């Protein structure tokens, strides 16, 4: 099995207590990766390293930053087969999802690289004579980046590339389910030639995660925090950062809906539905978790959806290829889903395809006639399961979409685009896709949600404000008048 260490100051090291933790395969129990198990002591060492490196890193010019980041992308692409292999072992990712993760990661680093000269402020008019008024965008300092296991590569990449190009250094906290992959992405950054202490990598058993996080948030060195993960945990992180008045970029849960109006190209909508629902076993925060369909069209749409869905391949990508539905991440994922499943089913829901789960194994499942009294109506379910909510009319569609506690991604299918736009513009979502799937992300385009999905933004120009100080600076004449 793979062996993985901590990374501080361009050095791969054991934890301060020489202790390890394992990532076992969720169905076979076979050890996939053994990782160094960081302590709080290690975490503080990581922050101190980041702080120290910041002293010179903040002054590195745009040309060098761009060159370095561009190189990271090149290096990540050069390691593509390893990423595919490791992601398949650790998080049951098919070659499709793994390969995409790499492309997306490399592209994030290139987009970030491109932004090097684009982190700009403004020169602003002032009534004051002989005075320059302007804004500057400067580096912040050490950033705490906490990254989950699902968008295994790209979620790390985004949480490194962007703070780097903004002149910051980062303490990267990886996932207990993905330690080989996160060590690997780190290694890529190392081989691109990033200065020592600019990127520091930590991973731990989940029993240690909270206190390691608390120590870093409470650490004077850490200036801002980005967190990607469950709303449940996100609130707790933000509550801690509030005790120290620290800004958070929160990238949390979703219940991303596909709105299928009575007008929809049913062929096209089914395709978007099948894709968005079951890519990476619905373990994407923006996976299509709802299909809100007009009653006039529902029966027909559901029939086609079910036909395609049943035909989808189930299996283990580390054992065999062409798996659409790989295993889930943990021998627990099905336990949560089944609780949601039973509740829905006892309240009138209808299994139109699939069945319940067991550990990390589940067939592609669709529930029809889901209603607002069922937990699964709005509770996020990280798995190859999705729900159909039927509705009557454009207004009720908007209502149902807007009644979610989340607001990450969404899709609206309708042949009348003027109409689709009305609903598209009225719904409370960070991402709206007119006649598109709910699973999209481009680096030029801001990525984030509203409500329980959090706040702040990765990607696009918007990510810059997340990792910069905005300073209002004036240059004034020596002689000026004062009231007293």
**Active-site amino acid positions:** 251
- Three-state DSSP state, 470: strand
Query: Which of its own copies, ligand NK, none sits in contact with 285, Cβ below 5 to 8 A by type?
Result: ligand NK
**Interaction residues for its own copies, span 223-252 (CB under 8 A):** 231, 234-235, 238-239, 241-247, 250, 252
Which of the listed partners (ligand NK, its own copies, none) does 154 bind, with a CB threshold of 5 to 8 Å by partner kind? ligand NK
DSSP codes of every residue in 196-234: TTSEEEE---TTTHHHHHHHHHS-TT--EEEEES-HHHH
Question: From the list 314, 438, 446, 464, which residue makes contact with its own copies (rule: CB under 8 A)?
Answer: 446
Query: Whose CB is nearest to ligand NK?
Result: 151
Tell whether residue 55 is a contact of its own copies (CB under 8 A): no
93 is a site residue for ligand NK (CB under 6 A): no
399 binds ligand NK per the rule CB under 6 A: no
Give the other-Cβ count within 10 Å of 245's Cβ: 6
Does 238 participate in binding ligand NK (rule CB under 6 A)?
yes
Residue 428's binding partner out of its own copies, ligand NK, none, with CB under 5 to 8 Å set by partner kind: its own copies
Residue 190 vs 409, nearer CB to ligand NK: 409
Provide the 10 A C-beta neighbour count for residue 474. 11
Instruction: Give 64's contacts (C-beta < 8 A, 6+ positions apart).
Output: none
Can you tell me which of 35, 150, 365, 410 binds ligand NK, judged by CB under 6 A? 150
Using the rule CB under 6 A, is 248 a contact of ligand NK? yes
Rule CB under 8 A: say whether 431 interacts with its own copies: yes
Burial of 205 from C-beta contacts in 10 A (0-12 / 13-18 / 19+): middle
Is the CB of residue 167 less than 8 Å from the CB of residue 50? no
Strands (E), 75-142: 123-124, 132-138
Q: Which two tokens stand for residue 283?
A: 């373990």
The pair of three-digit structure tokens given for residue 234, joined into one six-digit string: 């996100």
Per rule CB under 8 A, is residue 392 in the interface with its own copies? no
Give residues 289-328 in contact with its own copies (rule: CB under 8 A): 312, 324
> Of residues 263-302, which lie at the interface with ligand NK (CB under 6 A)?
284-286
Site string for its own copies, 114-153 (x = CB under 8 A): --------x-xxxx-----x-xx-x---------------
- Applying the rule CB under 8 A, the residues between 81 and 100 that interact with its own copies are 96
> With binding defined as CB under 8 A, does residue 397 bind its own copies?
no
Would you tell me how many other CB atoms lie within 10 Å of the CB of residue 297?
Answer: 18
Dihedrals φ, ψ of 326, to 5°? -80, 180
CB 305 within 8 A of CB 270: yes
Q: Tell me if 113 contacts ligand NK by CB under 6 A.
A: no
Q: Which stretch binds ligand NK (CB under 6 A): 41-49, 148-156, 299-307, 369-377?
A: 148-156
308 burial level (CB within 10 Å; 0-12, 13-18, 19+): middle
Q: Which residue's structure tokens are 């007119």?
A: 434
Is residue 445 part of the contact set for its own copies (CB under 8 A)?
yes
E strand map for 355-439: 365-368, 385-391, 409-413, 431-434
Interaction of residue 271 with its own copies, rule CB under 8 A: yes
Residues contributing to the site for ligand NK (CB under 6 A):
150-151, 154-155, 238, 241-242, 247-248, 284-286, 441, 455-456
């Amino acid at each position: 099995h793979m062996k993985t260490k901590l990374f501080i100051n361009n050095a791969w090291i054991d934890s301060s207590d020489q202790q390890t933790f394992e990532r076992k395969h969720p169905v076979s129990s076979e050890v996939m990766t053994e990782s160094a198990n960081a302590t709080v002591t290690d975490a503080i060492k990581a922050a101190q390293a980041a702080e120290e490196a910041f002293k010179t890193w903040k002054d590195v010019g745009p040309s060098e930053r761009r060159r370095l980041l561009l190189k990271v992308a090149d290096v990540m692409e050069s390691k593509t087969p390893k990423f595919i292999e490791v992601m398949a072992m650790e998080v049951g990712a098919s070659a499709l999802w793994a390969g995409f993760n790499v492309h997306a990661s490399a592209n994030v680093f290139r987009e970030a690289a491109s932004l090097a000269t684009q982190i700009q402020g403004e020169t602003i008019p002032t009534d004051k004579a002989e005075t320059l008024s302007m804004t500057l965008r400067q580096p912040v300092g050490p950033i705490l980046s906490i990254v989950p296991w699902n968008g295994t590569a790209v979620l790390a990449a985004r949480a490194i590339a962007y703070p780097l190009v903004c002149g910051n250094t980062v303490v990267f906290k990886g996932s207990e389910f993905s330690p080989a992959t996160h060590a690997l992405i780190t290694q890529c950054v190392q081989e691109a030639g990033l200065p020592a202490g600019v990127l520091n990598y930590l991973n731990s058993s989940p029993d240690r995660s909270p206190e390691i996080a608390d120590a870093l948030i409470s650490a004077k060195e850490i200036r801002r925090i980005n967190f990607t993960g469950s709303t449940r945990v996100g609130s707790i992180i933000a509550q801690k950062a509030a005790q120290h008045l620290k800004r958070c970029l929160l990238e949390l849960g979703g219940k991303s809906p596909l709105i299928v109006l009575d007008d929809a190209d049913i062929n096209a909508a089914v395709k978007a539905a099948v894709f968005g629902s079951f890519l990476f076993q619905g373990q994407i925060c923006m996976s299509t978790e709802r299909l809100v369909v007009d009653e006039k069209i529902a029966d027909e749409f559901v029939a086609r959806f079910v036909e395609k869905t049943e035909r989808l391949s189930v299996g283990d990508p580390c054992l065999t290829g062409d798996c659409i539905i790989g295993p889930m991440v943990s021998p627990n994922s099905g336990e949560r889903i089944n609780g949601l499943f039973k509740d829905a089913i006892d309240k009138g829901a209808k299994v139109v395809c699939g069945g319940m789960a067991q550990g990390a194994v589940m067939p592609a499942t669709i529930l029809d006639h889901v209603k607002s009294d069922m937990r699964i109506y709005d509770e996020e379910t990280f798995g190859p399961i999705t729900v159909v909510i039927r509705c009557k009319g454009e207004a009720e569609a908007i209502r149902i979409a807007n009644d979610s506690v989340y607001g990450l991604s969404s899709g609206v299918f309708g042949r009348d685009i003027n109409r689709a736009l009305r609903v598209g513009m009225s719904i409370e979502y960070g991402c709206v896709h007119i006649n598109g799937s709910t699973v999209q992300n481009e680096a030029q385009a801001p990525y984030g949600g509203t409500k329980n999905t959090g706040y702040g933004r990765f990607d696009g120009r918007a990510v810059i404000d997340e990792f910069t100080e905005l300073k209002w600076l004036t240059i004034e004449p020596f002689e000026q008048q004062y009231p007293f």
